[PDB]
Amino acid sequence: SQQVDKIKASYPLFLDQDYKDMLAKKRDGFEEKYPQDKIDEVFQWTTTKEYQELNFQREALTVNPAKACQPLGAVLCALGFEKTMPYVHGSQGCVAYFRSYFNRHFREPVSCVSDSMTEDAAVFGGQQNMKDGLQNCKATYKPDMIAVSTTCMAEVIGDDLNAFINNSKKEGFIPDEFPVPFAHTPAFVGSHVTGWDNMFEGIARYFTLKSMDDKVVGSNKKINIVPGFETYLGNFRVIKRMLSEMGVGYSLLSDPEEVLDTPADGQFRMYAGGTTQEEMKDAPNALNTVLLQPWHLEKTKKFVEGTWKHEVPKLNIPMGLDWTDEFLMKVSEISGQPIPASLTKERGRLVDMMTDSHTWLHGKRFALWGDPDFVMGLVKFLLELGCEPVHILCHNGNKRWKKAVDAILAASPYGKNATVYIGKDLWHLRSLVFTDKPDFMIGNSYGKFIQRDTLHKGKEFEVPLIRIGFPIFDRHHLHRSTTLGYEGAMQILTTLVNSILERLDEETRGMQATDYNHDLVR
Amino acid sequence: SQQVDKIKASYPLFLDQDYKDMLAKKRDGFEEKYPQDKIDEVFQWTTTKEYQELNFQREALTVNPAKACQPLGAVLCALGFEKTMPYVHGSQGCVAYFRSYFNRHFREPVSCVSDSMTEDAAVFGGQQNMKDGLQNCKATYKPDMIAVSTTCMAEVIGDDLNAFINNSKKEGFIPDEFPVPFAHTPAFVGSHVTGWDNMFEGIARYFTLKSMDDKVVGSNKKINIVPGFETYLGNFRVIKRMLSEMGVGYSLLSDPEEVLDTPADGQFRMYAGGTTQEEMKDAPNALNTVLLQPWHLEKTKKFVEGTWKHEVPKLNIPMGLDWTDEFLMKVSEISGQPIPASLTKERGRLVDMMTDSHTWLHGKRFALWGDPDFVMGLVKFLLELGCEPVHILCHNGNKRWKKAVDAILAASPYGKNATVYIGKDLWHLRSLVFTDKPDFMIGNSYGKFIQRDTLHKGKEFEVPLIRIGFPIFDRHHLHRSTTLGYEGAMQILTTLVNSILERLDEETRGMQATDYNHDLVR
Amino acid sequence: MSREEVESLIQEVLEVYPEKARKDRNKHLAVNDSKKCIISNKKSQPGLMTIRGCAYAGSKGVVWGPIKDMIHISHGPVGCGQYSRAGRRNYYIGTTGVNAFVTMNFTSDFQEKDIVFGGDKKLAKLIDEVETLFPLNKGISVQSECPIGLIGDDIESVSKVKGAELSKTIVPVRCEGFRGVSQSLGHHIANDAVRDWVLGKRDEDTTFASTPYDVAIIGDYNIGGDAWSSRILLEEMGLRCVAQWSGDGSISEIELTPKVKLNLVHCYRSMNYISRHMEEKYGIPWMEYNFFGPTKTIESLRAIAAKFDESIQKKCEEVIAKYKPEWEAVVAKYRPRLEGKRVMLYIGGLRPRHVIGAYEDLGMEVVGTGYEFAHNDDYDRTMKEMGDSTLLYDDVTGYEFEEFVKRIKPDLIGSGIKEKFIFQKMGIPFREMHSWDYSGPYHGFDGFAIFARDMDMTLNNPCWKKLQAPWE
Amino acid sequence: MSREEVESLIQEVLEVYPEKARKDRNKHLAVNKKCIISNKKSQPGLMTIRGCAYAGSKGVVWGPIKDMIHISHGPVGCGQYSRAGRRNYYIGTTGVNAFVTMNFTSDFQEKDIVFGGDKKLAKLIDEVETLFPLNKGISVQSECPIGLIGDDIESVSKVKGAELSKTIVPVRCEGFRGVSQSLGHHIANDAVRDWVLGKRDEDTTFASTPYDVAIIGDYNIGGDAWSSRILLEEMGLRCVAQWSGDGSISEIELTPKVKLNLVHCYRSMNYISRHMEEKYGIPWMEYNFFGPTKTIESLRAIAAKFDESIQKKCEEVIAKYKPEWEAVVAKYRPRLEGKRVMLYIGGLRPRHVIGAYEDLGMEVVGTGYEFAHNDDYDRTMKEMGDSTLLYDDVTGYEFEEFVKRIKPDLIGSGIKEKFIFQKMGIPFREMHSWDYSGPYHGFDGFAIFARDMDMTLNNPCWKKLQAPWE
Numbered sequence A, B: 001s002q003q004v005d006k007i008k009a010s011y012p013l014f015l016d017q018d019y020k021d022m023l024a025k026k027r028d029g030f031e032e033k034y035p036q037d038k039i040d041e042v043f044q045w046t047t048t049k050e051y052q053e054l055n056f057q058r059e060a061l062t063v064n065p066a067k068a069c070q071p072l073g074a075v076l077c078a079l080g081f082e083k084t085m086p087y088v089h090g091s092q093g094c095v096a097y098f099r100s101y102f103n104r105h106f107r108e109p110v111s112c113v114s115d116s117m118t119e120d121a122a123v124f125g126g127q128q129n130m131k132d133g134l135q136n137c138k139a140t141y142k143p144d145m146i147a148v149s150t151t152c153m154a155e156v157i158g159d160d161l162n163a164f165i166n167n168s169k170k171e172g173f174i175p176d177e178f179p180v181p182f183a184h185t186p187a188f189v190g191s192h193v194t195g196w197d198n199m200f201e202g203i204a205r206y207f208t209l210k211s212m213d214d215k216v217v218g219s220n221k222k223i224n225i226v227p228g229f230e231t232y233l234g235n236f237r238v239i240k241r242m243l244s245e246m247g248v249g250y251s252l253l254s255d256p257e258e259v260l261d262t263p264a265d266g267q268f269r270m271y272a273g274g275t276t277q278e279e280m281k282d283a284p285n286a287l288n289t290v291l292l293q294p295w296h297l298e299k300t301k302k303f304v305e306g307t308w309k310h311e312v313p314k315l316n317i318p319m320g321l322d323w324t325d326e327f328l329m330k331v332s333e334i335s336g337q338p339i340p341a342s343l344t345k346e347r348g349r350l351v352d353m354m355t356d357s358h359t360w361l362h363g364k365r366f367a368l369w370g371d372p373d374f375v376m377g378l379v380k381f382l383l384e385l386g387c388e389p390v391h392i393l394c395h396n397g398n399k400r401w402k403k404a405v406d407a408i409l410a411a412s413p414y415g416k417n418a419t420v421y422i423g424k425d426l427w428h429l430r431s432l433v434f435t436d437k438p439d440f441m442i443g444n445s446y447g448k449f450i451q452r453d454t455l456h457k458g459k460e461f462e463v464p465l466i467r468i469g470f471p472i473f474d475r476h477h478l479h480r481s482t483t484l485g486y487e488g489a490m491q492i493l494t495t496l497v498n499s500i501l502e503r504l505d506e507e508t509r510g511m512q513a514t515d516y517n518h519d520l521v522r
Numbered sequence C: 001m002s003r004e005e006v007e008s009l010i011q012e013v014l015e016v017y018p019e020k021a022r023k024d025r026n027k028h029l030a031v032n033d034s035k036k037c038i039i040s041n042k043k044s045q046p047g048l049m050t051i052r053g054c055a056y057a058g059s060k061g062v063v064w065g066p067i068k069d070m071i072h073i074s075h076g077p078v079g080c081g082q083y084s085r086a087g088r089r090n091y092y093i094g095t096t097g098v099n100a101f102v103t104m105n106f107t108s109d110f111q112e113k114d115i116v117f118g119g120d121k122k123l124a125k126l127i128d129e130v131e132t133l134f135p136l137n138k139g140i141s142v143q144s145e146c147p148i149g150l151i152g153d154d155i156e157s158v159s160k161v162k163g164a165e166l167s168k169t170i171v172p173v174r175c176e177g178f179r180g181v182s183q184s185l186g187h188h189i190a191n192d193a194v195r196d197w198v199l200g201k202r203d204e205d206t207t208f209a210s211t212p213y214d215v216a217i218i219g220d221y222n223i224g225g226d227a228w229s230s231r232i233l234l235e236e237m238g239l240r241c242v243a244q245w246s247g248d249g250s251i252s253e254i255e256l257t258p259k260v261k262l263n264l265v266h267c268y269r270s271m272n273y274i275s276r277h278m279e280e281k282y283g284i285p286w287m288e289y290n291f292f293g294p295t296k297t298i299e300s301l302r303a304i305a306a307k308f309d310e311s312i313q314k315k316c317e318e319v320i321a322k323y324k325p326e327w328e329a330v331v332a333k334y335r336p337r338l339e340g341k342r343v344m345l346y347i348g349g350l351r352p353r354h355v356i357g358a359y360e361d362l363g364m365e366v367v368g369t370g371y372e373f374a375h376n377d378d379y380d381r382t383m384k385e386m387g388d389s390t391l392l393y394d395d396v397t398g399y400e401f402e403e404f405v406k407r408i409k410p411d412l413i414g415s416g417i418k419e420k421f422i423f424q425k426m427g428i429p430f431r432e433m434h435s436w437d438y439s440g441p442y443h444g445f446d447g448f449a450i451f452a453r454d455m456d457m458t459l460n461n462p463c464w465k466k467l468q469a470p471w472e
Numbered sequence D: 001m002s003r004e005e006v007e008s009l010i011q012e013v014l015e016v017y018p019e020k021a022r023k024d025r026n027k028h029l030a031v032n033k034k035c036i037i038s039n040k041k042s043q044p045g046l047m048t049i050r051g052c053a054y055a056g057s058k059g060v061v062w063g064p065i066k067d068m069i070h071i072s073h074g075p076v077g078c079g080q081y082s083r084a085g086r087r088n089y090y091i092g093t094t095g096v097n098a099f100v101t102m103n104f105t106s107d108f109q110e111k112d113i114v115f116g117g118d119k120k121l122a123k124l125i126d127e128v129e130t131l132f133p134l135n136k137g138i139s140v141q142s143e144c145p146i147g148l149i150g151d152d153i154e155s156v157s158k159v160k161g162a163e164l165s166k167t168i169v170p171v172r173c174e175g176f177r178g179v180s181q182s183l184g185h186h187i188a189n190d191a192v193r194d195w196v197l198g199k200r201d202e203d204t205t206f207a208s209t210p211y212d213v214a215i216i217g218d219y220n221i222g223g224d225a226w227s228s229r230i231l232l233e234e235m236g237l238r239c240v241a242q243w244s245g246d247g248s249i250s251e252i253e254l255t256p257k258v259k260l261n262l263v264h265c266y267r268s269m270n271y272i273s274r275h276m277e278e279k280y281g282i283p284w285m286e287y288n289f290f291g292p293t294k295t296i297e298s299l300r301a302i303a304a305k306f307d308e309s310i311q312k313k314c315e316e317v318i319a320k321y322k323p324e325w326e327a328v329v330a331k332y333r334p335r336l337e338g339k340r341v342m343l344y345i346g347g348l349r350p351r352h353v354i355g356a357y358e359d360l361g362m363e364v365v366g367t368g369y370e371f372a373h374n375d376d377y378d379r380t381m382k383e384m385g386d387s388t389l390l391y392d393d394v395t396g397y398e399f400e401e402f403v404k405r406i407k408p409d410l411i412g413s414g415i416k417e418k419f420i421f422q423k424m425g426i427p428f429r430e431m432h433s434w435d436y437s438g439p440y441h442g443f444d445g446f447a448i449f450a451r452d453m454d455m456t457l458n459n460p461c462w463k464k465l466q467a468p469w470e
């Protein structure tokens, strides 16, 4: 039943007595459900260290991973180039999922095509799909460039992307000069960030490999900036803002900020902004190339060092205070531009915020996860805040990365109780926040089910989630935020301290019970 | 007791059994407390409409006001001028409170002096305090300007500020050329925003009234901007940002943004930035003067129009979509500058966010409070969002203001259930949120006690607070945020929708009870 | 509208395609006037940005995923299982991670070693790990992703052997994304998997006490509670709903379904296969029904009641009489606010025709509709619901849908997440008609109230008058 | 760091002043009667840190009393800036039976200034009774204008009090009276004496024991009084009353029945303590519950006033908490040893917390008060080291210049000082509000105090003030 003046959606509609009785009857009559005492018993067992030991012995089963597959990252990279259509050679189900996954996070259109390889192509290859696909895409959506990656079915059957594209141009399906960079992006190797590295390196080679005789390092007086897999609009914007403030010439190579933030003004714009093909052709003439996320840009690094002859600086992701300092001093040294007063002031206002908030942050214990560069930058900033990053989980991390993070933890008293986990997932992490409970989680939306699990054990065991990372589906417009530079560090700090105070306010809101500490001033 | 490895502060230390027993012993032995049944019965009574009727019949008693006194605003206005020391003629206890109040909101030093009038000056006037106070202040703190307001003691006994200041110069306590603008700011008239208006008008007269014969309206080709009482750093920053984007020459008259945000770099800066004296002297040469908060700049309006001969445009506070549009179009007309593509896109990105979030905002009911201009802009934007601002409270509001807000409500279906209250306090509002429960409150930190009260009635009756206003003491660095222009509207939008979504996540977090609606994607 | 103007539209839009695509797409666009109008269920043309998914989405996403006390393995690389985790709101009651598992992502996370050596022994070790860490699971399905078939794995062999070893129902599903042309073949593959591996379990068991009013809801995936809002009406009418396929469904409910007296089919497209099978093997008849809007829901309740006796037919009229003041207040409030507004729909295999009556109950007109993956029997059923000279599009391309919207200018569009933000930027109100835009239920009388307020809140929202800056 | 060096620091800083201010401020700066002057008027325009008498009476003494309703009588300013600013903790149902964090005010308008607020006061008392029936008394805290316009709050109190059979306390704590919060204490003490303390003089129904005691001058900042009361009752004493921290009007009225008054804050509560000895014969003694050394010393001295069974329980309490505070020192003293602290607070803590700093191996190199009297400085001489800096009613200028030279490792002061020194790179702890932490009293408070001094002094943020390119 409904009252037309106060209509109820599923919550709280189904808490009406008649729905509750109907659900009880369905369960008792036909579901043959385990008894509630048995469910409670098994739940309590899944919170124990005994269960955790069994949990960490898993070799074949993955539960709630914290990573996606390569072609997702290839799409995001391709989206950052001007009037470019990402094109995934292979089966079409992938592209539906790619577009939806990014739709949900950015709340924006996400343009991407497939060449719809089906049953027949497994036996005879996808050559004809590429010929008709490139031609159809070119004529229908009129991009200036098509950036080709692969689904896993096309990887397994061994389709030669290079030959298929060359034959498409030979047979006249698309003009010979029409740009079609490509990258093999197998879903069963690495993760989404690997797809980004592969796609970018493929675009770099396409516009540069056979033209190096013309290039002189430094002749265009700019610095190349390679963002890597990046899903915060504020991170593209903050980098271009700081470099402009310094008066540094730069090229941001893969820049999707415009396409992922078009205005709603009455017209849909399939393409907007983005790195131009020319910026790619001219990138070898830069002073140097800086990798914002080096731990998933290994293949790109070898190309810019091996072919462009740039001496890529050893720089961490510019997150937190120290690493933003080192980033700006490296950019200053390469460009000869002094760090301006405006950035020195901004640095000091971040430091000022750290002194204002350090008493609430001190000793706070966090479980966190995400991609390798993001995770280590968050770990670094947490230690600078005097917090303890107790559980550090990177499903797609590697051994060399873990060594680096472990050495970062060892350089601080606040890393004494921290452990770095690679190859582990959110079901592993569920156990860690039960057996060695932190104060908060910092992670993506999938973290919400861990918070729900902790609350089921008891309010005193609930671990609240703080949403920083990718994907974030259950809050709106957090993709506009910033996590890099002083700006991003100021945002993270403010998010952290106020999550702490909001939880404190919840725990002290009880009248005559806990509200003696319900302070007006904190 | 304490465990040295997990030290408990007041919460949760006093939940230990031995403290709990000790507190029960204290109450039962010596407090002669009303029994819990009587306390419960009286609480439930304070939630009824019968209590609300007696509550609204109050004439003499005020409970939990939502305003402060005049000199608080005079101090904030004075702080916005270059190397200016705010100086309150009267008793010293006021200045201690003004400094502490702004200290806790901005988390910054707040420099202000008193001339410590005591019992004996209450019988013979504070002329000697003025003479020694100005001389001591100038010598000790080296201000370029001293801006003088008054304490209610000094107002009641009738000290003539103009005479005392003139006598101080006559007798050589400070140079005759040293700027000492003054304004009478009685605490028993109006509120803190009245003291801002009075202090500003006093400063404008000091620098222009004598000099009008050489002035020509429009000759400097700028627009004067008068911000009014403003406690968000982002609001100063966004006005200067948008005007610079338009290429519009402007003069922000009273600009405390630098003094309220100095970096922590190893030195304390008593003064920083601010509106220069030369800018106030030249202000009559502007094309026009724009008042950002006209409902508490009446006295300034009359001086700017009557003496400077500027035709101050009728513009609302630039809050929300419509009133930011109108602000920019008026600035365009006055200055002859087109609204640039960058601001048109920013407008479009705000509209995009409105389309992305409208299904969760629609029909959401809000109780809100604050100063008149801020409140009417929040009301305006809420209607633009499809929300219902059902309880609109403005303790320091007047009849003509209420008329203006009522007409704004009548122009929208989303205002059909709204009521505007003036002269009412936060104890009146507590009754409204019990009898006509909204979904949220938008207000300052004093609202946290209303949420506590509503929760004590029951979780289904709790009305969560969203902190927008002044003062905000129980979260960190919200004073950095923005509420004006498109940028402020985007921030408010995001805070609103995500407060709605955070509340939904809490109500659906119960395992096997309500988590059928605990969606990953929202 | 003009039939002439709609046909000229189609011609103009097709003039951008190369000849081969133009000749194919021409057959998938038609103006309404049974059969000989449009073709469907064909391969997608490459590079044209179809909105379709794959067979895995059709098997794991829609049919198997909702089954709440089983654990469904996304078998292959890490991609498919992550993008589809908790993306469809197939609601359920359970203790997630303990006795229910719908919103979790179980996967074999294929690495290159698995592509080269095969994944069958990984699957076996994974099944053992599932048993130790999730003991209360009542069965396991193995949802094949693209590589499984290409590399020559045999999940059937692993299922039989491990199933006998552990006395567990382990269902192999060869729903690899390269099979078929859309999610449609995934439905079929999944239907046959239920048949071969689950549905026969209790063929020979007679412990279940049956009644003449035993019924099963076939093809309701309980989006936002849709099936709960349907079950309550059927049982207020005197029926006993033994099973729900697949929304909030348990394995035992499915195993009990061969004992019912009548199969109530909501989604014909996804479930007609298993309904025809149960009619062949068990003699259980099935019928189609529609719980969108008061007109259709009332029509359906009376049609279902006519299959039983006078006592059920009497309770039918009692249920109809009970909810009459409720939906009549909904219409009275929201119809004047939506009367005469025009809607364009693009959804999957059922809703593009099934919701038309609910729109007409609010005075709205559907000027265009189409399906991602429907077959020609779906379009046959669509000719009747749609008015003449309306636009039909099968497997519409992103380009076509934008061009159709630009010319027709509907007041409201109802489609999916990949379409939503496109048309919101063009200033056309949009409602998600898959996920209900995180709202719903839309089924039944209780769902119609939510449907109505949702269409009104978006169509008449103040944000739509603000798209154009007052300076242009 | 040398008598001579401090001496010349003082003259150097004083060179900025005009001569009048210079001659005065020289009397308020000293290196430890004959040493320093105090409780004098503040020099105009020098940015004193001091508050007013209303702060001393309403903010400090009366406001904490939880089952009374305190009226900030006058314009809206004072009650609002002081609303819930001091963490005088309490147990209660706020708005029905307890009222501490609420702001009740008569919100004076110009009509009240010209015609008097006495009829408005009586109307507001009726309204308080209608809407807050469980209040057990009302006080009227006078702001600046009440005395200046000639109102008679005493007559309203006596008349309405008799009409309603209610305790109504008129307090003439107008902010223009005195020179600081200090006179507010005295005025407030006298108002308690004159209108509350004697209510049960003819009442013989209270059941006394030989161990009845009262905690005088503990305002339960962050739970301070609770972490002290627990120790006293573990020692076998019965705490009949706590003034004003979590205090009730009935506890105040029962105080004349105790055997011994335990005075923590001498400055604010000595007046009423003197009176109770004069009128009721109740002796009083000062104690100090800051840090383990002072707490053990205080427990033994208090127990010595009683009998052997109390002194037996004293040694049991001391033995119980010995491993706990010894664990605190073992963990935190090595992290704070040898660090130098400067303090500037109100009237008690500038001397009372010194022993706690020393229990962690820290050295107080400068201290001073906003509003102390000469007898406070007499007691400070014995607590402070030789050749350390003393400052009475320090100006903002002086404090900054002293810190620039002394370069302390940590500063303990108030909210108006905190963000100045943080920007200069010097760790700061609020020694009024405990920086929203605490309690700091007793053994349980020493653990928190040590943890707080360490977290701030040794925080990583302090090494980051200078940009690496600067």
Ligand code: ICS
Pocket (backbone or CB within 6 Å): C058, C062, C088, C183, C221, C223, C267, C268, C269, C270, C347, C348, C349, C350, C351, C352, C433, C434, C435
């Ligand atoms: S199953 Fe089908 S695409 Fe019948 S695959 Fe799809 S939850 Fe659609 S039009 Mo998403 S044939 Fe269901 C459907 Fe309809 S996922 Fe849902 S909305 S009624």
Ligand code: ICS
Pocket (backbone or CB within 6 Å): D056, D060, D086, D181, D219, D221, D265, D266, D267, D268, D345, D346, D347, D348, D349, D350, D431, D432, D433
């Ligand atoms: S009452 Fe006094 S200023 Fe003794 S007015 Fe002040 S809660 Fe201070 S040094 Mo704030 S004489 Fe108490 C005090 Fe000390 S408010 Fe507190 S910290 S021990």
Ligand code: CLF
Pocket (backbone or CB within 6 Å): A069, A071, A091, A092, A093, A094, A095, A097, A150, A151, A152, A153, A187, C054, C055, C056, C057, C076, C077, C078, C079, C080, C081, C144, C145, C146, C175, C176, C177, C178
């Ligand atoms: S059509 Fe369908 S969704 Fe596509 S893969 Fe195939 S079953 Fe799966 Fe999965 S992992 Fe990633 S997203 Fe693909 S490339 Fe391989």
Ligand SMILES: [Fe+3]
Pocket (backbone or CB within 6 Å): A106, A107, A108, B352, B353, B356, C421
């Ligand atoms: Fe968007």
Ligand SMILES: [Fe+3]
Pocket (backbone or CB within 6 Å): A352, A353, A356, B106, B107, B108, D419
């Ligand atoms: Fe600060």
